[PDB]
Structures are given as structure tokens and as C-alpha cells.
């Protein structure tokens, strides 16, 4: 029972109806991710091969990060005037780093499981999934506290620098994405084939996830001032990118991953 208006039965959404057309997608993402997480947790009971049991925690954290992305996209439309100002610049980076570091963990597991070596343990894959996200949670919990306590708050910064800081904060997850892309591109020289479909899954996912980023960040930095699309196409395009990245993660990665790690 939450709308996107001025205040208390006031003028409705302008420019575009980027309200329920993202809220319903977020709700569907939450429901499907809950069901998928339940199925993936029940998957631990029936799996007998320990070669792929190692990546199960990394996929679990990817599912948790995608659930966080959907839940943030739920709280990414009310604009920067409530107490939801801190979350939009901390949780976004944290969950993006979590997801792309899980991708990097899976890529490293493929590298060390395709060229004759042995897959890392649960501890090692979990540690490498969270370690690349440690720098981002540090950077985000630094930015958010430094602004909401020391400097001038979020709700009094100009929009010309209120979304440039988004790029400034996400340069690290951009580097994480670039590292994942380079690793899964370098996976090409590999004799074993039973894990190469996972590598091509990572390659397709990161190519799509660098294409969604090569425009949207560039759009907010360049075109919205020229297209007169700010700050009205400022937040809705970010929520659109968030929800479609969450959906491409849940659909073009987790469904095919569950297809090649099927239930028998």
C-alpha cells in the first residue's frame, strides 16, 4: 500500500509510470528468489558430488545479494528525501560487490577446476567471495557515515554531484566486474569441458552486465543534462538498471546454473 506521489493523496507520478511497473517486478523477484533459495537449500540434501558442493555457498551468497538488490530496488523509488538516503549509497555498492565477487569466486573455481587442479574448499571459496566485498563494505560504510554525520547530509547536495558520487563509489565494483570479465575470458585455454559451460555462462553474464553499465552510468553523467532528463530520469533509470540486473542475474545465471546442476 505504498505509492509514489507528492504527499498524502497528492499529485501522482510524472514523466513516466516507473512505479508499480518496477514494484511488481521487485515483488516477483522477491517471491521467485525466496522459492529459489528454498529449493537451492533443499539441494544440499540430495547432492552427493563434492566437486560442485564447493560452489554451493558462493551461489547461496549470490542469491542473497540478488535478494538484497531486489529489496533495495523496492526502496529506490521514494527519492532522496526520507531516511532511506543512507541505504541507496551503501547497500547498492555492498550488494553489487557481493554478487560480482561471488562471480569472481566462481570464475576462480572454474580456473582451478578446469586445468587439472582441485576445487577450493568451502572456506576458500567463501573467503574469496567475501574478501573482494570487504573493500566495498569498508568504502561504503566510510562514505555513508562521513556524510550523514560529519559533512552536509545527502538531502542537501545538488543532483549534479549526488549521482556523480554513485560512480565515484562504484568504481571498485566496476573493477571487480572487469576482473571477472578478464578471468572468464582467460578461461578459454582449458582442456576440461564439463565446467566450460559455466565459464561461458559467466562470460555472457558479465558481458551483459558491462553493457548495462556502459550506458546507464554514462547516461547519468552525460546525456541527462543534455536530454533535460534530470533529476526526473535520475532515480527511475537507476532503479530500472537495478531491477533488470537483478533479473538477469536470477534468470540468465541462476536458472541455467540450476539447469546444469539439475535435480534428479
Amino acid at each position, epitope marked *: 500500500c505504498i505509492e509514489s506521489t*507528492g504527499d498524502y493523496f*497528492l*499529485l501522482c507520478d510524472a514523466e513516466g509510470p516507473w512505479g508499480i511497473i518496477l514494484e511488481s517486478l521487485a515483488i516477483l523477484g522477491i517471491v521467485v528468489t525466496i522459492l529459489l533459495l528454498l529449493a537451492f537449500l533443499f539441494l544440499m540434501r540430495k547432492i552427493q558430488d563434492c566437486s560442485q558442493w564447493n560452489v554451493l555457498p558462493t551461489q547461496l551468497l549470490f542469491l542473497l545479494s540478488v535478494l538484497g538488490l531486489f529489496g533495495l530496488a523496492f526502496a529506490f523509488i521514494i*527519492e532522496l528525501n526520507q531516511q532511506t538516503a543512507p541505504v541507496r549509497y551503501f547497500l547498492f555498492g555492498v550488494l553489487f560487490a557481493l554478487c560480482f565477487s561471488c562471480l569472481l569466486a566462481h570464475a576462480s573455481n572454474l580456473v582451478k577446476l578446469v586445468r587439472g587442479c582441485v576445487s577450493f574448499s568451502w572456506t576458500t571459496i567463501l573467503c574469496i567471495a567475501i574478501g573482494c566485498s570487504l573493500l566495498q563494505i569498508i568504502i561504503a560504510t566510510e562514505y555513508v557515515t562521513l556524510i550523514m554525520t560529519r559533512g552536509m547530509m545527502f*538531502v542537501n*547536495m545538488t*543532483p549534479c554531484q549526488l549521482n556523480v558520487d554513485f560512480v565515484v563509489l562504484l568504481v571498485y565494483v566496476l573493477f571487480l566486474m572487469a576482473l571477472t570479465f578478464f578471468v572468464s575470458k582467460a578461461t578459454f585455454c582449458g582442456p576440461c569441458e564439463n565446467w566450460k559451460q559455466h565459464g561461458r555462462l559467466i562470460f555472457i553474464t558479465v558481458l551483459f552486465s558491462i553493457i548495462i553499465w556502459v550506458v546507464w552510468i554514462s547516461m547519468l553523467l552525460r546525456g541527462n543534462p543534455q536530454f533535460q532528463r534530470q*533529476p526526473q530520469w535520475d*532515480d527511475p533509470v537507476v532503479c530500472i538498471a537495478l531491477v533488470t540486473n537483478a533479473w538477469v542475474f536470477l534468470l540468465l545465471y541462476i536458472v541455467p546454473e540450476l539447469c546444469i546442476l539439475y535435480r534428479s
Partner: nanobody
Amino acid sequence: VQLVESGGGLVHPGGSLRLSCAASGFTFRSHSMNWVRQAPGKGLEWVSSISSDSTYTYYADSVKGRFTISRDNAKNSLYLQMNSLRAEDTAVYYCARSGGQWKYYDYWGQGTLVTVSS
């Protein structure tokens, strides 16, 4: 707690001018501003009504395309771009801030008598 408007240019019709509304003593990111134009007879008429943090650009029906509004909460100022000036648009544009739930504007400015005409 008080609102003041700016603008004193004398531009021929077909030109451009910029309006402003500088205010302080109140929480800029707590309500919605309302540009309103003053015309003799009927009185007040609606102009663009930016809200929250520059996320609701409701240009008026009779001015949609010639007036651009924005909300800058850094200096606590509200601007207005009167480009492509119309001769039959001489009026006083008052600056207000809404209460929201009843669309009441408790806070008001002093307007600006722009006299663009042929």
C-alpha cells in the same frame, strides 16, 4: 521562514530571462514549492510545482515547454527559466511552499513584476 524572489531583466519578447526564489530559515527538503503567477481579476494561477528533491517537474498547462523548474537544496533556492518570452505573459510570479496534505501554502514570497510585452 521568509521567501524572496529575484529578477530584474528587461528583455524584448522572443528573448530569455531567468527567475529565482531565494529563501532560508526553514527545511528546504521537507515540503513542496509552488511557483504561482499573479494576474489582475481572477488572481493567482499555477506554475511549475517542483517537490521533494527536484523529482517532480509539473510545468503548468499554459506554459509547458517554456518554463523549466528545479529545486536546489544546497543554497536553498528555487529557480525558473523564462526562455522564449511571450508578449502576453506579463504577470507577477509569486513563490510559495506547500503544506502538502491540503495543498495549503503557509509560506509565501513577494513575487516579481516581470513586464515582458510587445
